[PDB]
Write a protein that binds this ligand. Sequence first.
Ligand code: K
Ligand code: MG
Ligand code: MG
Ligand code: MG
Ligand code: MG
Ligand code: MG
Ligand code: MG
Ligand code: MG
Ligand code: MG
Ligand code: MG
Ligand code: MG
Ligand code: MG
Ligand code: MG
Ligand code: MG
Ligand code: MG
Ligand code: MG
Ligand code: MG
Ligand code: MG
Lengths: 117, 7, 70, 153, 66
Amino acid sequence: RKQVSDGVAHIHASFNNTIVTITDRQGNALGWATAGGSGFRGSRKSTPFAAQVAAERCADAVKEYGIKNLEVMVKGPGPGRESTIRALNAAGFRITNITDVTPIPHXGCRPPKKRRV
Amino acid sequence: XXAXXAG
Amino acid sequence: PVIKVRENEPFDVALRRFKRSCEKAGVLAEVRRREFYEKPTTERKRAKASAVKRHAKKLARENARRTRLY
Amino acid sequence: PRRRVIGQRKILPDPKFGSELLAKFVNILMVDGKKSTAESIVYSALETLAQRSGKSELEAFEVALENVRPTVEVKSRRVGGSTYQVPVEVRPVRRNALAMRWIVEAARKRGDKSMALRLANELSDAAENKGTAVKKREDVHRMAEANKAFAHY
Amino acid sequence: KFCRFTAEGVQEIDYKDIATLKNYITESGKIVPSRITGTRAKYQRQLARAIKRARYLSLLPYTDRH
RNA sequence: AAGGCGGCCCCCUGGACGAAGACUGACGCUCAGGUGCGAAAGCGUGGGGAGCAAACAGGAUUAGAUACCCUGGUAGUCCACGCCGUAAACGAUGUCGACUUGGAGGUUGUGCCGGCGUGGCUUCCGGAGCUAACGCGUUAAGUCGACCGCCUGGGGAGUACGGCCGCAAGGUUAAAACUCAAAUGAAUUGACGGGGGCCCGCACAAGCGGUGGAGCAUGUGGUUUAAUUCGAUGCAA
RNA sequence: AUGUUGAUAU
Ligand SMILES: [K+]
Ligand SMILES: [Mg+2]
Ligand SMILES: [Mg+2]
Ligand SMILES: [Mg+2]
Ligand SMILES: [Mg+2]
Ligand SMILES: [Mg+2]
Ligand SMILES: [Mg+2]
Ligand SMILES: [Mg+2]
Ligand SMILES: [Mg+2]
Ligand SMILES: [Mg+2]
Ligand SMILES: [Mg+2]
Ligand SMILES: [Mg+2]
Ligand SMILES: [Mg+2]
Ligand SMILES: [Mg+2]
Ligand SMILES: [Mg+2]
Ligand SMILES: [Mg+2]
Ligand SMILES: [Mg+2]
Ligand SMILES: [Mg+2]
């Protein structure tokens, strides 16, 4: 609706799933897409390809706002870290920054117990 | 079991 | 890690420089480490084992340099 | 095989048109070593196709193959019980091999009178993208695109 | 490698000397290993204490993202 | 000292080490009983409770699944004070002292001028010697001395009974009958592994044609018979 | 992911 030239892409690349939210620089969400939303479930959902498609659909979601340049904020260890960023570049945008914003505690809280698979 | 083997 | 894409830089190059920065800071390794709790005994055992590997490498590495295979 | 010292065996070209592509088609059609029988069915069928198109025999055959030839296919890799159908590019030799095999398989399950007719009709449907052979090509492409995720290992 | 603090013959690393301390942190703000910088163990311990004092006084950052 | 101890700052405080002397003058070593400290879990009283998580619940998986996996989740994990007194509390190696070839480090003092010494603690290798062997090897499992603790086939049993301790959980001290001809350590050759590596075979894959259904031939099993002669009967009848 | 068992003596 209201035009935003300069935006921020946030990539929540978990092991199971990739969420791409494009916000403005004040962190207000304009649109989003997920690998899970984009016709991939289970094994396929957690692929770089499913994240690629999620990124494309997120670009289409924010076509109206007229975003030109993006700062990328990458989070988490997932498959869809780099494939997401390539896709946002491939879908028009000028990538100005790339920044890892993965939370790391400086010690923090005891993680869950190891899985005995 | 089998009321008591290897075949 | 925090890449400014500099003026007159290909994205592909800048992305490679981001991968470098993350692998240098060791973000993914840090995440995988902290995914599950490691008991202190487990932590200590792997630290010991890693040291012994590197040592038993170093000594036996020199042995390979000396002796002929053929 | 393991040692993997397998070239290509010398296929003699067909007598009529001198096409090794068509010589392979006869082989794929042939049963019980009855090559003479197979050649007659093909040449009969190509004649019929050449009339209905007015394209030439080999050229009408090429249009049939062009539509039935696959580009990608899936190969099964089992990963922890579940079966990952990984898409792979088909090599040019295998493209023709699959194209021809599908056409003959399609023709054989038709309910026309002779094989030569069944074959002519299937090549005709292939050229206009209607028959079971192009449906097979579509199905193979469908699975490949469905499993495009697993291509990028 | 080689240790600058042995070379100069320093007594304390000093938390106030930010120009020096900045050489022994990463871009991320993390303290660099002695195996990388070639610092002597004794000074590495002093340097860590100095960096941690500086981080408290907000002369150095804790991390790249504040 | 052991258990253990990890952001930064201050306060109180213990030990170790080194260099120069000076001082006391065998004041030492060990130590049954005794006393203290002693991970985690646990217990009591009062706090706290983010994250995690016995129990528990649900979802899966499965023949079942009172599990592993998933979603939750209470005690607990945290603090104060008190209790418990045990751990593969391990170097499975008691303490103290002396002596006996080397090499490469780490760490922390120090002397002489980057080198050359000299102390402390420590990691790895290895010589003699020792050892059943594995290995240990100046930080000994070598060579000796002092004192203490402890063992005497496997099981029954670290159990019973009694005592002591404990709020309890239990701890601690600690038998017997009975039963067996073993149980055990280290190493050796194999074999095996849902261990690793490297290879091969129509072993998979890629294909083509079959078998399993039909009728018949034929063999076998079974049943039947007076007899249905005897043998072959996973692959390899 | 899971994925049990193999009568006695010789
Ligand atoms: K049973
Ligand atoms: Mg989890
Ligand atoms: Mg005593
Ligand atoms: Mg406790
Ligand atoms: Mg309590
Ligand atoms: Mg309470
Ligand atoms: Mg759980
Ligand atoms: Mg004990
Ligand atoms: Mg012991
Ligand atoms: Mg040794
Ligand atoms: Mg008892
Ligand atoms: Mg008692
Ligand atoms: Mg096969
Ligand atoms: Mg049959
Ligand atoms: Mg018989
Ligand atoms: Mg006989
Ligand atoms: Mg017999
Ligand atoms: Mg078994």
